[PDB]
Design a protein around this ligand. Structure first.
Ligand SMILES: [Mg+2]
Ligand SMILES: [Mg+2]
Ligand SMILES: [Mg+2]
Ligand SMILES: [Mg+2]
Ligand SMILES: [Mg+2]
Ligand SMILES: [Mg+2]
Ligand SMILES: [Mg+2]
Ligand SMILES: [Mg+2]
Ligand SMILES: [Mg+2]
Ligand SMILES: [Mg+2]
Ligand SMILES: [Mg+2]
Ligand SMILES: [Mg+2]
Ligand SMILES: [Mg+2]
Ligand SMILES: [Mg+2]
Ligand SMILES: [Mg+2]
Ligand SMILES: [Mg+2]
Ligand SMILES: [Mg+2]
Ligand SMILES: [Mg+2]
Ligand SMILES: [Mg+2]
Ligand SMILES: [Mg+2]
Ligand SMILES: [Mg+2]
Ligand SMILES: [Mg+2]
Ligand SMILES: [Mg+2]
Ligand SMILES: [Mg+2]
Lengths: 58, 79, 136, 94, 116
RNA sequence: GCUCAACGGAUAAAAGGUACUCCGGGGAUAACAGGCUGAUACCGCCCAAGAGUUCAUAUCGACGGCGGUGUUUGGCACCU
RNA sequence: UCCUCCUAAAGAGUAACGGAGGAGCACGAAGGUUGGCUAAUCCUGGUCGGACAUCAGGAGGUUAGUGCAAUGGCAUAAGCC
RNA sequence: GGUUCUCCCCGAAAGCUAUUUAGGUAGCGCCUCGUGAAUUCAUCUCCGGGGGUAGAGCACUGUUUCGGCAAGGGGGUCACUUACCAACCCGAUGCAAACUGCGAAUACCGGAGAAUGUUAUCACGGGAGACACACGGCGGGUGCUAACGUCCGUCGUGAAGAGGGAAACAACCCAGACCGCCAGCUAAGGUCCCAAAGUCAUGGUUAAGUGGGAAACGAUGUGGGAAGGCCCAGAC
RNA sequence: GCCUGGCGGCCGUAGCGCGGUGGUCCCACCUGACCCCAUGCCGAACUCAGAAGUGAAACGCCGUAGCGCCGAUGGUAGUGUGGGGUCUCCCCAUGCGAGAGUAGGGAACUGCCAGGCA
């Protein structure tokens, strides 16, 4: 499709287990990971869930 | 005077919808002690002596509201 | 002092006091006194405030009471350990939200109702303001 | 009579209304008649003084907008609980 | 009044039959006529019917509204149901006592061959 | 066939004193003192019916309300 | 020890020497089935009879009833013969 | 109370139930090792589902104020009167953990789909430890919406996590330490000196060392905005 | 095409109230009841044998907005996630978004079988 870049930016220590599971599903491991994921509504929902800490490039 | 002395083990309220147990007659799909708002829809076998609903053989569990007084029934789609 | 004639239950949970008041309009009288903050309001306070304005106007006009002490407040004795059941009711209170109208008056001039409500506010613990009947 | 200048809103909801009220304005709705209802915004400072007069709810207002001249009548008002402010106004076409 | 009481009487069986899911022979009795019809398990479509308001049956009796006419109508229903092939119907009294004219019709059908 | 009701039921079968006391432990738990709190107590202030012949505030001040201290009676059991 | 409600945060579960009440039974019919029936309360009229007994009619439509505390149910009646 | 050499990997709990039990012990919940197994398990999108909490409301159960009509009761004669009170009903106005003719957001159960995750899921077997928790946020009971009080639900941290900030300061904010570098970029927080980095730029406000503790209430402190009475034919 | 009866779908926009209207057929009243059957007494109900008479009651249909009922748009309350403040309570970004009330709607719709009337 078009794909998009997702960077973790902030840390996940005092975050909720659901948010940590969202990060795991997105595949982000540390700060500044900059992973690439296909742009689909499910990925958009995952991004929106933790938008307060992730940064999107497109 | 006097406190504590509260009953224990209020059992259960809701045990599933759709093909959650499915197989055989099951023993859920009912709020025990309820009767009202949970009636047998014919598709599932009637209540037990303690007002417990259960299935016939198989199928999905569905809830509907129909008939006078707008009472809610539980039916099962045979498959 | 005002309190219910009979009580379905003699003790009640503490509960919280959140949100805005429901009755915020001058309905019965022509002038009203309405709260701006939140807090408790005891029967003794209501009674003293009532006397304030009632004697301020002596014999003139009519006065309404919008609030009413509904929930009881308990308190255990002085030298008593914690626990051993809940305390005993000591007085009745009314929970009031900001914007709640407390008292109203009809048959008095504005220039006198203002002073009567000033005197009543002096007694009341929560801060209040003067409002007019106006229209819808 | 009374003439009130209004602008058509472009974003509706709790946050938008709160921002409008922070900007010394307030939303209102014009409905009734046969046309579809439309939401507008008015200025609090000018509308409050005009509403203070008891004729505002008596005679027919004139909601002047970009060339429509709807001349509606005031139907309902929602005010702030504990201060002299206006939260919302419902107008019915007449 | 009387009709409402009859419906109240008949409701329980009326819907117990649908819970069991079976074709039901429903009979409606009036002082002047009598009707019977076979209702499908879903309760929406009629498979067979017969009464004393038609030219046939009613033109070959003394007076519609007696046990003889009830027996004639029962014979008609039984024969037509057999023609259609439907069998194993559940008779319902529809709030009437089973001993009166409704005793006939039912007796006539079961002797005709309908599996009461 | 058990009010084994201390109701998962130490025996079929069972009460007290120790200031003459003793052992193993505990600040996991009280008494003295410290700590937190400030209901109560002490001090201050707000309104002002009234007393003061007249006159609210020279001096007091009802019905009510808001604070300060850590200072009595209390609460907690954080240290020993 | 057991049962009902709230606390209990709209699945279940959830503590305090928290807030309120009950149980340690009863029935050989108060069980089964068939047939049938529908309440409280008020108003009008009528000997004893009246605020209230019984009778007739009309309002009302479950505010009645359930072997027993509370909750949830029950007109199809789980209520009455 | 004490329990003696080294390194590597993983890594808890202070809960439920029972207990002549409460600082003990047992089963389960949680940890580790081994074997086996299905697309199992987690996040997101869509679809189906029950609810009665927040909120709201007053038809019901209770309570509450005003107004109207008006049974009934009562003072004052022997059959009238009423400066008396008041049921039901109607209109308006509030309140409820043990009220509901309404009703979310979340959470939970089930189904389908993509991606991602060292199977993260389940079953069996060997070994355990643990059942004194603490504080902070949110929802509550109790207490005085007092306590570094106490008792629950859920999340985070400490316990068992070093480092940077809050002065000092387990439990607060940022952030998870394999080892070395006299290397670069950042987070919270900061840039006059102590002490690393703006005596940076533009537009305002404060005169109080306010900043750098504390309320009801009081006041021609001072900045800003929208209106009113009065008016140079003479205003204060 | 209508009108009527029976069995259903749906479960108040489907109800109630007020006015009008219907008898060829159907329906209900309606006559008698030594019998089948029955009344805690009563052909009131149930039941049987009929068709002299009437649409009065009941029932069906039509009109009517008095009540019941349904009900937007907008605003408000609440709330998940993230952040903040004088923090017993609130605010900001974002997502969800009531209840009540207002305008308004509203005198149901529909399937099968049978009969009267073309
Ligand atoms: Mg025990
Ligand atoms: Mg001695
Ligand atoms: Mg010793
Ligand atoms: Mg200690
Ligand atoms: Mg001490
Ligand atoms: Mg002390
Ligand atoms: Mg402790
Ligand atoms: Mg010490
Ligand atoms: Mg629950
Ligand atoms: Mg929950
Ligand atoms: Mg637990
Ligand atoms: Mg029984
Ligand atoms: Mg029966
Ligand atoms: Mg029975
Ligand atoms: Mg590790
Ligand atoms: Mg233990
Ligand atoms: Mg509430
Ligand atoms: Mg413990
Ligand atoms: Mg704990
Ligand atoms: Mg603690
Ligand atoms: Mg330890
Ligand atoms: Mg640390
Ligand atoms: Mg330091
Ligand atoms: Mg200072």
């Amino acid at each position: 499709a078009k794909t998009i870049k997702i960077t973790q930016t902030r840390s996940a220590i005092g975050r909720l287990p659901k948010h940590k599971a969202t990060l795991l599903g997105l595949g982000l491991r540390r700060i500044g990971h900059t992973v690439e994921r296909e742009d689909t509504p499910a990925i958009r929902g995952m991004i929106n869930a933790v938008s307060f800490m992730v940064k999107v490039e497109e | 005077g006097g406190s504590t002395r509260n009953g224990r083990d209020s059992e259960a309220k809701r045990l599933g919808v759709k093909r959650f147990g499915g197989e055989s007659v099951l023993a859920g799909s009912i709020i025990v002690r309820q009767r009202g708002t949970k009636f047998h829809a014919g598709a599932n076998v009637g209540c037990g002596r303690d007002h417990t609903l259960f299935a016939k053989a198989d199928g999905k569990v569905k809830f509907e509201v129909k008939g006078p007084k707008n009472r809610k029934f539980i039916s099962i789609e045979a498959e | 002092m005002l309190q219910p004639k009979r009580t379905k239950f003699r003790k009640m949970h503490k509960g919280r006091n959140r949100g805005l008041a429901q009755g915020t309009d001058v309905s019965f009288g022509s002038f009203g006194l309405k709260a701006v903050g939140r807090g408790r309001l005891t029967a003794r306070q209501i009674e003293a405030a009532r006397r304030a304005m009632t004697r301020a106007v002596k014999r003139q006009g009519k006065i309404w009471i919008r609030v009413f002490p509904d929930k009881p407040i308990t308190e255990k004795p002085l030298a008593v350990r914690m626990g051993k059941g809940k305390g005993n009711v000591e007085y009745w209170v009314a929970l009031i939200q900001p914007g709640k109208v407390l008292y109203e008056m009809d048959g008095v001039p504005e220039e006198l109702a203002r002073e009567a409500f000033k005197l009543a506010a002096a007694k009341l613990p929560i801060k209040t303001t003067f409002v007019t009947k106006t229209v819808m | 009579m009374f003439t009130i200048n209004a602008e058509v809103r472009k974003e509706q909801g709790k946050g938008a209304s709160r921002r409008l009220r922070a900007a010394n304005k307030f939303p209102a709705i014009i409905y009734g008649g046969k046309e579809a209802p439309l939401a507008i915004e008015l200025d609090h400072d000018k509308v409050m003084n005009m509403q203070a007069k008891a004729e505002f709810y008596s005679e027919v207002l004139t909601i002047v907008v970009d060339g429509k001249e709807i001349k509606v009548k005031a139907q309902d008002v929602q005010r702030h609980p504990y201060k002299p402010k206006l939260q919302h106004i419902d107008f019915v076409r007449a | 009044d009387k009709k409402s009481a009859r419906i109240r009487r008949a409701t329980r069986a009326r819907r117990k039959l649908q819970e069991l899911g079976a074709t039901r022979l429903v009979v409606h009795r009036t002082p002047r006529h009598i009707y019977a019809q076979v209702i499908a398990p879903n309760g929406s479509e009629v498979l067979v019917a017969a009464s004393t308001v038609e030219k046939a049956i009613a033109e070959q009796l003394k007076y519609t509204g007696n046990k003889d006419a009830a027996a004639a109508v029962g014979k008609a229903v039984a024969e037509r149901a057999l023609e259609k092939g439907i069998k194993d119907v559940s008779f319902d009294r529809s709030g009437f006592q089973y001993h009166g004219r409704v005793q006939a019709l039912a007796d006539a059908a079961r002797e005709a061959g309908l599996q009461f």
